[PDB]
Amino acid sequence: QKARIKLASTNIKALNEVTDQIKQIAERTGVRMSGPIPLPTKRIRITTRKSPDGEGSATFDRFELRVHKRLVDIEADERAMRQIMRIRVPEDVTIEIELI
Amino acid sequence: GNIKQTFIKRTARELFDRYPDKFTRDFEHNKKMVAELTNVTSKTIRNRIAGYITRLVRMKEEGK
């Protein structure tokens, strides 16, 4: 009877946006939500050598891509889904919803 | 080095030339006054300015 929402993004602006949206929805309406819950940030590190040749002292570039993760549970009302599915979902955010 | 730099010292002297008695000999009051009066977004610069102003006030008030 509860629906679970997973949010993933490289930017926190869109995340704050979507989460405040869902909070306003579930507060103006009568329906319960647990969260939002911050999951551990997932970072991808790629370390490579600068030089295109083999001469000179060796120096290394450390490149890092960060991914933030949020979780919510929304209680799965009918108006809930109808008013949640139609929200501005920018392109820098990935959303996945499932049932329990 | 604990050497306060150009704009720090200049802004202190200017905010002091103006609004003179709105500052006193306590770092906390001076800090919040600086925050009120200036458009600064970092705490380190604010605190250094406030400390320099405390020193200015001490020396002016009770000496040269």
Partner: protein, 54 residues
């Protein structure tokens, strides 16, 4: 005649992976489905979203 012109479909080895930008063979970043040489990755990383963060 027309057969001795195309390469076999290797499954493993240095000769089974190219760089889609430069065409090199050897030193290819293999990490997370990416197929780019170190040079090309170091050139186009920010346009993919990587940063300093050091």
């Amino acid at each position: 005649k027309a057969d001795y012109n195309k390469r076999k479909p290797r499954k493993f080895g240095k000769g089974a992976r190219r760089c889609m930008r430069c065409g090199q063979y050897g030193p290819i970043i293999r990490i997370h489905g990416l197929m780019l040489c170190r040079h090309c990755f170091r050139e186009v990383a920010p346009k993919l979203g990587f940063k300093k963060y050091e």
